[PDB]
Design a protein around this ligand. Sequence first.
Ligand SMILES: Nc1nc2c(ncn2[C@@H]2O[C@H](COP(=O)(O)OP(=O)(O)O)[C@@H](O)[C@H]2O)c(=O)[nH]1
Ligand SMILES: Nc1nc2c(ncn2[C@@H]2O[C@H](COP(=O)(O)OP(=O)(O)O)[C@@H](O)[C@H]2O)c(=O)[nH]1
Lengths: 345, 271, 420, 420
Amino acid sequence: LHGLLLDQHEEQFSLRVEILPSYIPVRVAEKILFVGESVQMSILKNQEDTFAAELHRLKQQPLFSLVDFEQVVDRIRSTVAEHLWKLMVEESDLLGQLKIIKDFYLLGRGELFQAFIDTAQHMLKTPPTAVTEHDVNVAFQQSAHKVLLDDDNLLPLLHLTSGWAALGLSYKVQWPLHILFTPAVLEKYNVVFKYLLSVRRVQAELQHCWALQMQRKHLKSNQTDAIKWRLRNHMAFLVDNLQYYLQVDVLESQFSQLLHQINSTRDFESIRLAHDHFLSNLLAQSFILLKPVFHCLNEILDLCHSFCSLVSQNLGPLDERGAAQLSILVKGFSRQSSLLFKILS
Amino acid sequence: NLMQTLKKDYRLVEYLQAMRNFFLMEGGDTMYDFYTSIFDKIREKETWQNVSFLNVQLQEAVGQRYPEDSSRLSISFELPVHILDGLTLSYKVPWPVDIVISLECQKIYNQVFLLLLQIKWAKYSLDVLLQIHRMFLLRVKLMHFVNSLHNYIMTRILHSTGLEFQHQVEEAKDLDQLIKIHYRYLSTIHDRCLLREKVSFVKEAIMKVLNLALMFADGWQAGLGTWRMESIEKMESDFKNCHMFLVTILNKAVCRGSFPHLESLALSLMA
Amino acid sequence: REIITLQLGQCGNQIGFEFWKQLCAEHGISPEGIVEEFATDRKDVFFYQADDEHYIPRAVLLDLEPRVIHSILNSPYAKLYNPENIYLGNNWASGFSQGEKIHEDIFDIIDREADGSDSLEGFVLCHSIAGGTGSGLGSYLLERLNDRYPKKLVQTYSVFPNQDEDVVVQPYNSLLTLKRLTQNADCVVVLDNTALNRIATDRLHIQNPSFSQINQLVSTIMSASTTTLRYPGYMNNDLIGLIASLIPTPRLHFLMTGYTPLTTDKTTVLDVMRRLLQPKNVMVSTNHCYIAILNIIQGEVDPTQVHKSLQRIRERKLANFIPWGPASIQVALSRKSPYLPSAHRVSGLMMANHTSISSLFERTCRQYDKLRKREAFLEQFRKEDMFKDNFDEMDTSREIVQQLIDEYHAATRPDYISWG
Amino acid sequence: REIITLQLGQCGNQIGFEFWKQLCAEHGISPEGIVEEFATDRKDVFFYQADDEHYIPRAVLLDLEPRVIHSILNSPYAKLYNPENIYLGNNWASGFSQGEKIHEDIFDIIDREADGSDSLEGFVLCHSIAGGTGSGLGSYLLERLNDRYPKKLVQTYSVFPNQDEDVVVQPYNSLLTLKRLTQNADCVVVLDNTALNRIATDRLHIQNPSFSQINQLVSTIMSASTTTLRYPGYMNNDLIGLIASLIPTPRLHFLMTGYTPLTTDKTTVLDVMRRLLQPKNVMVSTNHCYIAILNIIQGEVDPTQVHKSLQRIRERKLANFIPWGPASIQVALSRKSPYLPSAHRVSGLMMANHTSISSLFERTCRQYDKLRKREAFLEQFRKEDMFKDNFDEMDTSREIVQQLIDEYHAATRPDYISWG
Ligand SMILES: Nc1nc2c(ncn2[C@@H]2O[C@H](COP(=O)(O)OP(=O)(O)O)[C@@H](O)[C@H]2O)c(=O)[nH]1
Ligand SMILES: Nc1nc2c(ncn2[C@@H]2O[C@H](COP(=O)(O)OP(=O)(O)O)[C@@H](O)[C@H]2O)c(=O)[nH]1
C-alpha cells in the first residue's frame, strides 16, 4: 500500500523463495511484488485506507483462509495494475512510440535504411572504432535529412563493437515512464535488427547487379552463351526475394495483433504478456531463433555476396578465368538450395 | 522570501546582467569605443599602461545612466606577438549581493575578458587595412579563419550558454542554489572556450596562428607597393602547415575529449 | 532516387497533365503547389521540395507545333508545375527531324533538372506510339538519353494505340517506334485505346467522348503503378527493386495492366485477387502463358489471411502460366491515402509480363506488312524520302520486331533456356 | 560612430528622404525630429542628438535645377532634417561641370558636419547611376571625397538603372560613372530597377507606378543593411567590420541583395536561411560562382538551432560557389525593433559578392559599344564637346570597366593568383 522498502530487516529487490511460508502459494507471492514495485513509480492513495480496512479486517479474523487472502491481494491487484496501463496508453503514448520502434528498428522505414547503405558503403573494412564509428552515426543523421524526416531524432545512435558485420542500434527510453522496454528486451530487438539488416543489404547488391538490362545488353549484343554468367541472377534472386515477401507477413501479421490486443485489455501486467509473445513469435517464425535452417540461409547469403563480387569487377563482358569462380558458385548454390528442401521435409 | 526581496530591493538580476552586457562577457557598442582607442598606434606608449588614461577612457564609454564601480585599474602584468596581457578590469559589487558574486570568481570572468580583446584585436588588425595582390589573396585565407574562431567563441559558446543561465536563475529559489547554478555557468564558460585542461596540445596552436596574422598586418601599413617582402612564401607555408596541425589536433578529439565543443568548430571548412 | 518524367507530344502531355493533377489531390498539394491546412509520405521521389513548401513536380513538358500546350498553361495548376521548362507533323520521320535541330536546348533542360536532383534514378516518358509529333520525337529522345545516362534506366508509359484501325501511316510510325523501344528502353508499360474504350463501354455509357474519359482510366493505372514508391514502408521502396521481377529477359520488357475495381466509385484479399485474374478486369485487348505476375493492394487489408489467400488462388489456378522462368505471383501491400475518398476500401492493380501482348504487336506488323506491299502510303513527302531514301529502317525495324514476335513465342516453348 | 549620407540627385534624394523616414518610425523619433512620445536603440549613429528637442539626422541634400527638393521641403518631416544644408542637365558631362563651380560651398557643408560630429566613419551616397544630374555630379563628388579624406571610406547605394532600356545617352552616362566608382569607391551595394519591378509584378499587381512603390523596396533593403550597426549587439556594430568579409579584393566591391519575406507584410532559421538562397528572393536581374556570402536575421530566432541550421544549408548546397577565396557563408543575428509591426516574426536579408553582377555591367557596356560605333548620341552639345573634345574618358572608362569585366571572370578561374 505505501511502497516502504525493508518494512523489516532481512529474514529493485525481488522474491526470496526459500522463506515463503508453504501455504502461501508461489503464485500469490508473485502477485504481491507487482503491486509493490508499481507503488514506487495513483488511485491507490485515494482508496488506500479502504484497502487497509480490509487488510485490517483480515487481521481480526481467528483462522487463516487462502481463499480469503487472495481475494484482497487480488482486489488490490486489480486497481494498482490498472493504473500503469491507465497512464502509459494515454500519457506515455505506449501505442504511438511502438510505431517508432518498428519504423527505425525493424527496418519498417524505406528511406532511412536504404539511402544510408548507399551513402555509408565505405565501412566494409574491419574497424577498430577509431574513425568509422563517428562517421556511421554521422551518415545516419545525414541520411534522414534528404527528405524531411527531421524532428527530434537525437535519441537514435548506431554503435560499432566486418565493416557492416556489427552495427547494433540503441534507443534511450524514459525509465520512470517505461518499464515495458527493459535492458534485456531491447537486446532481443537488437538481434532481429542485425539479422533483418543482412537480407536488406544482399537484396540491394542483386537489384544493382541487374545492370545487364541497364548496360551490358542495352544497345550491345556482346556475346550470348559464349560470354554470359548463365543469368543465375534469377535463381539467387528468388531465394532472396522470397525471404523478403515472407518477412513482410511474419512482421506485419504480428504488429496487427500486438496493437489490437493492447487496445482491448486494461492491466499493464497482462499487456506485458502480449509484447513478450509479440517479440517471442517474431523470433522463431522469422527463423532467427538459431536453427540449422538459419545457418543454411546465412551460407546462401555469403555465396550470394561472392557472386555479386565476380560480376562487379568484370566490367565489359569477358571471362578473366571467371568461369572457375562461377563454377564453384554455380555448384555451391545448387548443393545449398537442396538443403532448403529440409523445409519441404 | 529572500530571493524575491533580493531582486526588487538589492537588485540581483540587474547586477548579474551588468556583469555580462557592456562588461567583460559582451562588448556591445560601449566596448567598441573603449577598445579602438587603446589599439590606436598614434600617441601610444609602448604598453600604453597609464592607469589614469585607461580609467578616463572607461568613463567616456560608461554609456549608461549608472556609470560607477568600473575601474580598468588593476596593474598590467609585468610574448611571441605583442601578446600584451594585463589591462585587467575589476567591478566593485556591494555586500547584500557579494554573497553570489565572489572576489574568487572575478578571476574566472577576468580570464575570458582577455581572450575576447585579443580576438577582437586580431580581427580588428585585419579589418583596418583597405605578389602585391598575392598578399590580398592571403588577406582572405587569414580573415576567414580568425573570423570563424570569433564566431564560435562569441556566439556558439558564450551567447547560447548565457541564455540558459539568464532563464534558469529565474526559476531557482535559494541562496545556495543561486550560487551552485552560477558556479556551474562559470565552470562551463571557462571550459568550452579553450582555456583549461590541455594547453600545449590545443591552445598554443590558435595562439601562434593568431601571432602570424598579428606579424602579417604589423609588417604592413596602407598606401605603397615597394614592401620588398620575400617572406610571403615563408608565411604562406607557415600558416598552411600550422593550420594542418590545428585541424588534425581538433580531429584528434574524435578518439577522446570534448567532442561536442570541438566537432562543432573542427568543421572549419578546412582549405 | 528522384525520377524526372519527360512528358512529350499532345497525347502524352494530356496524360502527364492529369497524372500530376491526380498526385496533387492525392498528396498534400494545392493547385498553386503550396501545402494545405488539411494536409507521412516520401513526397521527394516524385516532387522537388522548394524552400516555401512549393512541391513542384520534376515534369519536362516538350511542345511541338503546340495547341494543347497552350490550354495546359491556362489552368489553375499552371503555378503548380513551374520548372519554367517548356520549349517550342503527323509523320514519324516529320517528328524525328524536328527533334534533331532542337535536341541541345531540350537536352540542357534535362541537364538543369539532373543538376537539381541529388541522385537521378530514371526517366519516365508519357510516350504516345504513332502519336504524330509524339512518335519520332519520342524515339529520337529515347536514343539520346541512354547514351548520355548509360547507367540510368528509362521506362515508357506507352499508350499503344488501337482504335479498331485517322492515320493512314499509323502502322509505319508505330513500326519504327518499337524498334527504338525494344533496344533503347529498359522497361515499357503497355496500354490500349480499344481495351480501355471497351472498359468505358462496359462500366459507363460513354462512347463518343472516349479520349477525355479514358484519360482518367490511364491516370488511375499510372498513379497506382507508383504508389508503393511514393508512400513510406519497406515495400519495394525504390523503382529498380520493383522493375526486376516484372521484366525477366532483356528483350521482353512490355507490361500488361488490370484494376480489380474498374468500378472503384468490405472486400477480403481472397476476393480482390481472384477478381483481377479474370479478363474483364484486364485493360489490354498455340499455348499462351504469363512469364511472371505481381500485384499491389491499397486498402483495409487484413495481414493474417494473405498467406491463406496466397494459397487459395494457387489451388483455383485462375492464372495459367508455364514460362521458362520459375517465376511466381507475388503479393505486395500499400496504404490508401487519407483526404480523398476511401470508396472500395480495398482496391488493387496488377502489372504482369504476358505473351498475349505479342499478338497486339503482330496486328500492327500485319497492317504494316499489308501496307508495305501496296506502298499505298509511302508518304514520299520530301521530308519522308530525303530523311529515308533507302526506306530500310522500316525493314530494320521489321526484322527487330519479328525477332521480338519470335522471342515471345519462344518464351511459351519449354526451351527459352536456349536462344529465343 | 555617426555616418553622414551624401544623398544627391532627384532619384537619390527620393530614397534618402524615405530611408531617413523609415528610421524615423523604426527608431524613437517623431516627424519634427522631437522624441516619439512612446519612447535601447542607439539613435546617435544616424541622428544628431542634442538637448534640442529636434534630433536632426546627418542628411546632406544637394539640389540641381530643383523641383523635388521643393516637395521634400513641403513635408511634415521638414523639421526632422534641419542641418540647414541644402544648396542650389540630363547629361553626365552636364552634371559634372555644374558640380565643379559649386564644389567649395557643397564641400564646406561636408566640413561643417565633419567638425560638428565626434567622429565620422564614412559618407553614404544615395547615388543614382545614369541619373541625369545625379550622375556626373555624383562621380565628381566621389573623386573629391577620397583625396580630402584619404583614411576615410565611401560606400554607394547605387540604384543601377535597368528599365528594359527615356535616356538615349544612358549607357554613356553609366559608363563614365563606373570608371570613377571602380577606382574611387571603397564599397558599392548594387540594386536594379527591373529586378525590383519584376519583384513588384510578383508580390503585387503594381506595374505603371513602378517608381513610387519600388522606393519602399529599396528602403527596406537600405534600413536592413545597417540594422546590425544601428542596434547595439555583441558583434558587427561598425560598418567597416560588417562589409570586410564580402569584399575579398578591392576591385570587386559590388554587393548583391535579397530578402526572405519579400512579403514580410513561426518560421525557423533552418527555413529562412534556405529561402534566402532561392533566386525569386534575389533582387538583381562558363561556370559562375559567389565570392563570399553573408546573412543577417532580425526576429524571434532560437540560438541552439543555428549550428544545426548552419550545417543544414551546408548539406542543401542551395548556394554554389568555387572562388579563389576560402570564404564561407556567415550567420549573423539582430533584434527586430518594438513599436512597429512584428509581422513575419523572423525576417532576413543577405549581402553577397556574386560574379553574376558582371553580366549587368557588360549589358550597359554592350549597349554603349553598339552606341559608340553608331555615334548616334555623341550629344555634341557644346557642353559635351567643350568638356570632352577628345571623348577619350569614355575609352579610358571602357578599358577600366573591361578590366573589371575581365577580373570578375578571373575570380571564377582557379588562378586569381595571377593578376585579374
Ligand atoms: N489515351 C489517350 N490517347 C490519345 C488522346 N488523345 C490522342 N490520343 C492518341 O494520340 C495518337 C495521335 O496523336 P496526336 O493527338 O495526333 O498528336 P498530334 O500530332 O500532336 O496531334 C492517337 O493514336 C490517339 O490514340 C487521349 O486523350 N487519351
Ligand atoms: N529606384 C527609383 N529610381 C528612380 C525613381 N525615380 C527615378 N528613378 C531613376 O532615376 C534615373 C533618372 O534620374 P532622373 O530622375 O532623370 O534624375 P534628374 O536628372 O534629377 O531628373 C532613372 O534611371 C530611374 O531609374 C524612383 O522613385 N525610384
